[PDB]
Design a protein around this ligand. Structure first.
Ligand SMILES: O=C(c1cc(Br)c(O)cc1O)N1Cc2ccccc2C1
Ligand SMILES: O=C(c1cc(Br)c(O)cc1O)N1Cc2ccccc2C1
Lengths: 360, 360
């Protein structure tokens, strides 16, 4: 039988998560020796990542913590942590340990499938029950960025293990494509967004792609990346760009295209999506990344970019259109997980009071 | 005779600066009744603004505060505050009070002429004497943004008073042009930057300007603004864009132009400057606004934008080029001074220790 969950949470929250680079993920093998190594790694690392973020959940305002949906998500994290604790004393040499471990990871992944919308219901419950306040809102914003990035990282570890140690893409390493053709992903996201735009507006802007391979002008641009994450970001951006374009051109039969540039530099692989959808005033830009003003499409997309040391930035020109840029690291060695850690500095952010700001 | 300066500093630092809108500045008259009102306003408001920022100087790390150049700037602020205290008991009805007051403001403006480079020498002295450290560096960054924005605001008040109550542009209200033609300022800044680029490189990119007046497509874009501030920002941006363009095209006789779009929306007047100067990796972008990595051209330009509720943002694409955007408020009623205030929230920022960050 197991100890009470808080004993495990306190134990594992003392450790810092260990960030892996894309290259490290990529250089992970599929042998028995490798599966045992993955097992011995994950039975420590997953509990560390679960515990670290569970400790930050406890720092949320009582108001948010008291909501049924936040309490529900907490309970899932507790059970998932306990599921892994069952493996602490198990022998990696026993093939049944390994197969049971993979089954346990699948069960955890499914348990947590609806975490994003469930947390969003928690935010709504807080607003409905108590009314929102600026202090709680700032804490929620800080927390959710960290919580969702933590979740992305945990899903990455689980997907890598289950895909490698249990199809279409045998050149992929788990969910990683060592030769991801960026323009092909751009086209896939455009195609899917076009289906949606065509359905509702009976029209959609065309796509124009330009590549700038600075060091090798002829060569198609490739990278090591998780294509599903890149797809997610581009699909969200195309939906917004298409909607803006059609909605700002109600009188017109001719729609300006969405232009995408893919640039490969020494350090960055940058993807800029430019539309002439009429733009948004600067005042309204920050709110596009707010969990409260919402529709977590944009904030979660930016977290995917940030997860491997990239970013997603918007700059609009009200009256004209908008540019969105996805910044990725060009090199797999620079693509290192960005993971929140529970410590004093973290703890300090939730320690805020209501007072006059430092500006007039 | 006067009280010791600290007594005045404590008294006036209790008040918050009072931000004025561009419209309020603009609706200020030049009569005798108006000059007395300006006097009675400024003999309170200037001491409040001087005292508020002097209190924050005292919050700097001992290391920075101990430098000769920071001590020198402090001493100027003390004397300027005392100069104004001489007017506390003077009668506004006496025309000699008014003329002496204008003389005192001119003397203050001249005294403080070299504040920006003198503070920069203070930063260098701290680095040379002690070596820099991350905690002090963060405090310096926070402080200098506020200090330089405060200074901009004090110079604005002084220039308005001295220009109105003591030439080429009689349609200007002090330093304010109620009908500033934005493209004409763009062209002036380009011309001056071209002279510099031509001198050093014997070549420079051409300029292309496009205006998008969303609500009135034919009409040239105008605004209420201080043209010298807009010029300053554009001149800095053109110098950077030109240098990048020529330096990334050493082999070429044909230079890509710098393209400027001026867009007027419902709320924003946005100016985007686009170059094909080869770009900068994202990692190096933040540092362009750092006082420590430096060359205060960019950070001070962004402060001018922020001063009337605007901003100046850079987004590059490494391997291709860079876009810089100046965001201004379109309406004089939205163009309100952005002024730092000395209070608890302000005080808290300088209260930081060296510890592990909240990220891995
Ligand atoms: O500028 C934008 C816009 C916003 C984002 Br985020 C983006 O990634 C691309 C865009 O073009 N919009 C969206 C939108 C939707 C309906 C109507 C107007 C607008 C104005
Ligand atoms: O991308 C840039 C660049 C930077 C800024 Br800030 C700007 O406002 C415009 C630019 O185009 N640069 C500057 C510069 C100077 C010499 C050489 C290369 C580069 C690359």
């Amino acid at each position: 039988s197991l100890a009470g969950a808080p004993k495990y949470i306190e134990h594992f929250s003392k450790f810092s998560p260990s960030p892996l680079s894309m290259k490290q993920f990529l250089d992970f093998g599929s042998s028995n020796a490798c599966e045992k190594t993955s097992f011995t790694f994950l039975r420590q690392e997953l509990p560390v990542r679960l515990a670290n973020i569970m400790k930050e959940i406890n720092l949320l305002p009582d108001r948010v913590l008291s909501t049924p949906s936040v309490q529900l998500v907490q309970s899932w994290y507790v059970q998932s942590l306990l599921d892994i604790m069952e493996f602490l004393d198990k022998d990696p040499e026993d093939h049944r340990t390994l197969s049971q471990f993979t089954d346990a990871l699948v069960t955890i992944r499914n348990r947590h499938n609806d975490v994003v919308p469930t947390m969003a219901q928690g935010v709504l419950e807080y607003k409905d029950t108590y009314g929102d306040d600026p202090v709680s809102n700032q804490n929620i914003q800080y927390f959710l960025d960290r919580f969702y990035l933590s979740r992305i990282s945990i899903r990455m570890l689980i997907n890598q293990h289950t895909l490698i140690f249990d199809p279409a893409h045998p050149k992929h390493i788990g969910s990683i494509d060592p030769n991801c053709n960026v323009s092909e992903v751009v086209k896939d996201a455009y195609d899917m967004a076009k289906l949606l735009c065509d359905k509702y507006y009976m029209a959609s802007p065309d796509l124009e792609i330009q590549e700038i391979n600075a060091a090798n002008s002829k060569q198609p641009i490739h990278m090591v990346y998780v294509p599903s994450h890149l797809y997610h970001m581009l699909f969200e951006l195309f939906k917004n760009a298409m909607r803006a374009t059609v909605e700002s051109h109600e009188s017109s039969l001719i729609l300006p295209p969405i232009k995408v540039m893919v640039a490969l530099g020494e350090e960055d692989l940058s993807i800029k999506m430019s539309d002439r959808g009429g733009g948004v005033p600067l005042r309204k830009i920050e709110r596009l990344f707010s969990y409260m003003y919402s529709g977590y499409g944009l904030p979660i997309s930016r977290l995917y970019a940030k997860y491997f040391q990239g970013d997603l930035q918007l700059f609009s020109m009200e009256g004209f259109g908008t540019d969105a840029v996805i910044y990725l690291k060009a090199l797999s060695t620079d693509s290192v997980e960005r993971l929140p850690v529970y410590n004093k500095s973290a703890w300090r952010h939730y320690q805020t009071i209501q007072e006059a700001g430092d500006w007039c």
